[PDB]
């Protein structure tokens, strides 16, 4: 390229190296207008500020807009100087680029304005010489996701109906639709809980002689509500099978299927130790508050976001449990109590001490046992505390992200209302002009021509 | 688009006015190649009344030759120069191109109804005479009246000068600016 | 919008799109002026250096102070310029916004 | 100093202080000039506007570029000014420094641009005032580590597979060997743990299982590990530095116990060493180091915060000593007196350090409970002191890891851009051969090279 075009004469000296090794007809230099750099510095004005500079520096990189001859539209010959109306200090960075060959980005200016001024001067965004590139790209990504949040473009026969159902607050309808479902899920989970207390539903106070088995009917009714609501959601989903794969959808199906499979087991051939598992699965209805609580969605999305470090946490704690269980088990295999019967037994002792839980159920008795158990406790507290701050930071980050997304959605609705008000004001201004600073007159004449070509007029 | 080679030749505009035109062109589209949606917004902004998406779409499709997907400065300035300060006989070729949507130079009573409905959607909903649902096709038939009954570009070209309204309408902007 | 006045003549060409359909009295352009462009790079010196801008660039938003003849309150006649006594760097952002 | 020349005539007046004391030839002022001041406000226009300064103001530091007649290289004769082609705002700071003799570094500017502007004007970076010098040094160190990461490593025979071996995500064979040796480490540790379970290696049923087959499972695995270690002995770029690396130390430590137990049972039956053998068998867990991406991060983090962990150790030991002594001395009179010694109180103080709590050992006197509570709180604060530093270093190193990956991707993109530019220049030359002012002489030199080598250039 021409990036060092001020060093052409030196290259001519390089040619002097290779005459005695040359064999050719010598077509001679191809001639030129002038064999010097007499091209004087050009004064160019950017919004009333003149930036004098050498012309050869400008044609050093003709591929951009400032190069070639596409700059002559902005030339102002009747005083003989290029004029521009861009931001002076921003263009100063492009001037430094032309002087040097590499561009920088100030970390105190709007990235967006930097972007359209970058694109305006016909230069590639990534011509930054990797000294300001990192913060440039970070700011670019930040404002890119900012505008992506700005572009959520949420909309408002059944197509709008099921959206209104999806709407958290439609005053009369949505409040009822969600509160009643929350009441159903709450009564279901509390009923599943209370069927255990002796006086509630069990032979805990009936041995002497209330234990009415009717909460089963309540469970049947509430799972009926669950499945009819799931059918309504399926009718709401534009893509049946695709939206079946939804997380809330899988929660619904795994909350409603235990009831059906248990009732199918009732008349099926019975297998020992199978009813307890379904009665365990009964409690999954508590997960239905995802539609009720936004914080549950926040936590789930955070876990889906920060997952690799949680994997490293689990892997590290597995090494810790294995090492310390082994050292405990071989440290106090032979003793009076011999509580560490096996490595699975030592698993409990170590796990109750990484978390600094502490029972006294089974404790070290050898001196090395006590020392290494204390070391185990310290190492475990370090391990468990290792990823907690990144988890809480991600959670807070997502929380504030959604908060400011809601705030900016309200703000964009406000500015859309302002734009509509401005449109109404323009219409009223044209109406006033029709009844009875040169741009507005031409605009009125043009809109009169639009009325004429359609033989139609406008009335308040 | 060098700033001087596009003088009054092939673009009937002086270089001083060409500078202003290019500056106004670049200030809204600094990339130098105008996209469709940019044209839609820049055309419908001057009318706070009903939308102008489809009419601007056909305008761009006429502007966009060889199906580039976006128009650069040279074709833009050429078409603008021809449309504003063109020749009385030569101007209507691009007008027929505007009214020719089926590529080939033929009209089968359907390339003009959509243009009329797009134009008449401009008036909004507070129009002094109410645009009845049959009024668009009514004015379509009105335009058909001057169009050849027998089964076009040639008849329209040879009948445009018959109606003095069109010829006196060309000089509305032919001389101005 | 009022800030895209430089594209206003182009909309004139848009008439040719509906001109064959157009039929009426056509009261003609309302006494247009300056057929050739006479855009003046008006100078605005703010407590020191100066900033030059096109007249339509400053007048595309007449609702503001710099529109209309209000700006001429700060016009400096003996020097043929607009000597505003405001901060000279926020005015830079105002000029960028106006553009 | 040389920047206070305006006060030089005042020092002349100081002669009057010792003038009656003065007695000598007085060779008189050396042909002084311009009795009246003729200070010219010389103008320096830098890529645009101008800055005016007094001649002595620019000449009070002639050691720099702007001193002497060197500045006249950038002097513009036809305009009667100094048109420098440098940045016009750093020059403002240079002018302020020249006036003051002290340079301030504004915070909000790129360091590369600031430093190259400093070098262009012939300055030294060491004249920054301490108010700005600390910030400039922070910026220096951050961009220095940035540029260090910019050129850390680049991917560049029998030794060749070594690069494949130590970068297993390069070739299929290296990746399969890596995964399978990780599987072998896992299966060996699982073999150990399922050996420890009573169902496998205990007399659960003396009447009848106890498999001695596990005695093979380790050995084979051990031998397998050896080969890759031997592999790293074969393709070793450094014969001794590789062993000095901590990774090799961990590998040999994990390898040794089987062989040392072989030798021991071949010669002796040393009591207490076989259990030590079983204990050390587990360090395949540490051998997992290569597979665990974050274990290297953890090790480097622990290495970085060495002073903090040492201070933690010292402080916790002091607290344990103090509290154990206090509680043993104030609790030895109890009936049970489970605080039978200072080591006996050590265990209680250490279980109350970490909020652990066992209830097996608790005080029974009024002073005992309150001292134990204060002990617990002090232990909590002491142990919580260094964890923020530890986790800060860990998260930091995680961030440099990911950012180094991104920077490596950026450098790959930049080399692709450079080769694309080279191809563009090549095809421009080729089309010029087929068919700006600078390209004329560029292709003229290219054709001169073609003539001097009589070798025509093709596409």
Residue numbers in the entry:
A (entry chain C): 2 to 157, 167 to 219, 224 to 450, 472 to 495
B (entry chain G): 36 to 186, 191 to 216
C (entry chain B): 2 to 100
D (entry chain D): 2 to 157, 167 to 218, 224 to 450, 472 to 495
Could you give the paper's own sentences about this structure?
Here we report cryo-electron microscopy structures of the Kv4.2–DPP6S–KChIP1 dodecamer complex, the Kv4.2–KChIP1 and Kv4.2–DPP6S octamer complexes, and Kv4.2 alone.
The structure of the Kv4.2–DPP6S–KChIP1 dodecameric complex supports the additive contribution of KChIPs and DPPs to the modulation of Kv4s in the ternary complex. KChIP1 and DPP6S interact with distinct structures of Kv4.2 to modulate its gating kinetics in different manners. In addition, KChIP1 and DPP6S do not interact with each other. The structures revealed that one DPP6S binds to one Kv4.2 in both complexes through their transmembrane domains, forming an octamer for Kv4.2–DPP6S and a dodecamer for Kv4.2–DPP6S–KChIP1. Owing to the flexible position of the large extracellular domains of DPP6S floating above Kv4.2, the overall resolutions are 4.2 Å and 4.5 Å for the Kv4.2–DPP6S and Kv4.2–DPP6S–KChIP1 complexes, respectively. Structures of the Kv4.2–DPP6S and Kv4.2–DPP6S–KChIP1 complexes adopt the S4 up and S6 open conformation, like those of Kv4.2 alone and Kv4.2–KChIP1.
